[PDB]
Amino acid sequence: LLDTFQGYNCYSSALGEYAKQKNIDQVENIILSQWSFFFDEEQFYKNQWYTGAADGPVDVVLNEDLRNFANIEVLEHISSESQAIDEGRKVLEKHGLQIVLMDFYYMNSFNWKSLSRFNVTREHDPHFAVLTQINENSVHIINPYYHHEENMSMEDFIKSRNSMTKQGKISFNSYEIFSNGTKKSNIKELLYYRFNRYLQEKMFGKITQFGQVVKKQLDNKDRKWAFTGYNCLNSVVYQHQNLINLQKKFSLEMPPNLQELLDNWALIRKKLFEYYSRGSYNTEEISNLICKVASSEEQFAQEVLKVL
Numbered sequence: 001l002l003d004t005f006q007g008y009n010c011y012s013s014a015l016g017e018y019a020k021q022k023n024i025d026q027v028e029n030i031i032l033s034q035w036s037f038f039f040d041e042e043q044f045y046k047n048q049w050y051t052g053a054a055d056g057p058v059d060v061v062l063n064e065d066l067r068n069f070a071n072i073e074v075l076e077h078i079s080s081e082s083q084a085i086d087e088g089r090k091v092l093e094k095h096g097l098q099i100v101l102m103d104f105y106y107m108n109s110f111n112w113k114s115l116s117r118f119n120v121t122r123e124h125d126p127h128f129a130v131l132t133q134i135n136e137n138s139v140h141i142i143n144p145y146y147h148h149e150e151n152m153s154m155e156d157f158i159k160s161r162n163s164m165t166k167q168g169k170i171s172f173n174s175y176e177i178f179s180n181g182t183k184k185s186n187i188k189e190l191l192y193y194r195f196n197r198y199l200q201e202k203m204f205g206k207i208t209q210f211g212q213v214v215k216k217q218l219d220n221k222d223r224k225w226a227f228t229g230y231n232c233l234n235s236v237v238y239q240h241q242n243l244i245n246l247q248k249k250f251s252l253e254m255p256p257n258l259q260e261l262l263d264n265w266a267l268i269r270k271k272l273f274e275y276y277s278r279g280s281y282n283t284e285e286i287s288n289l290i291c292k293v294a295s296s297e298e299q300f301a302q303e304v305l306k307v308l
């Protein structure tokens with residue numbers, strides 16, 4: 001396990017890791033001060049990632065934050081098999097790193113056997129990685145979200161970048177952090193804007209919506225939603241941990257229950273994974289935990305604005 005920038009999702013992890021290694025200001029703090037929740041009932045039924053901090057794979061709200069606060073643009077480069085590796089060589093020669101979108105079917109990000117899950121289903125899911133080396137027959141990629149690295153055959157790497165996925169066709173997509181005129185933001189300004197937006201957009205109500213949809217799964221013999229939800233909600237745990245770390249680094253005023261809320265989300269994740277794998281009939285219990293944390297998060301956001 002590498003000491004990679006965690007961010008709160010694969011996209012923000014890759015952007016932050018790049019910024020960390022290349023000394024690009026503001027990107028890390030804008031990521032670490034995100035405060036967000038979404039729920040898409042239509043994605044729930046298609047077994048797509050349907051909740052957590054942000055829709056993806058690209059975090060468009062984070063891109064808007066990066067433009068608004070730092071005048072930083074994350075440029076999407078599409079390419080072709082004829083040009084992509086050569087463009088990669090030019091980017092590595094200049095910058096040493098390239099942010100790429102890859103089909104994670106073709107790599108082994110996370111050790112499921114750590115949670116006693118041995119039936120590790122391969123899925124055509126797009127995730128972000130950082131390319132660090134191009135050799136003749138192989139590449140080295142860092143998966144900062146999962147703290148993993150691997151060497152991949154050039155054949156496999158090319159397949160991972162031209163693949164049809166659940167969320168659409170990858171075409172050698174790469175992502176360039178760019179600015180023609182940067183801006184500095186203070187951490188309290190970033191948090192103020194995020195917490196006001198969280199309350200204005202009633203993001204806590206999307207947690208209640210999620211809880212209500214969980215209550216309605218009592219008769220659903222397909223428990224895959226609970227696994228997807230488990231994976232989706234790591235982003236929320238990471239935001240809570242990131243805010244705890246910001247509190248410490250910047251000696252911030254926080255409401256006193258931030259750790260309790262992190263614990264509440266970790267317990268919801270544990271119960272979702274146990275429901276998925278252990279055949280319990282506790283959708284009502286999990287629904288009740290989610291609806292409880294929704295109320296707690298609304299109050300927490302109000303209190304952050306009072307004390308920040």
Ligand code: NA
Binds near residue numbers: 009010057126127
């Ligand atoms: Na991802």
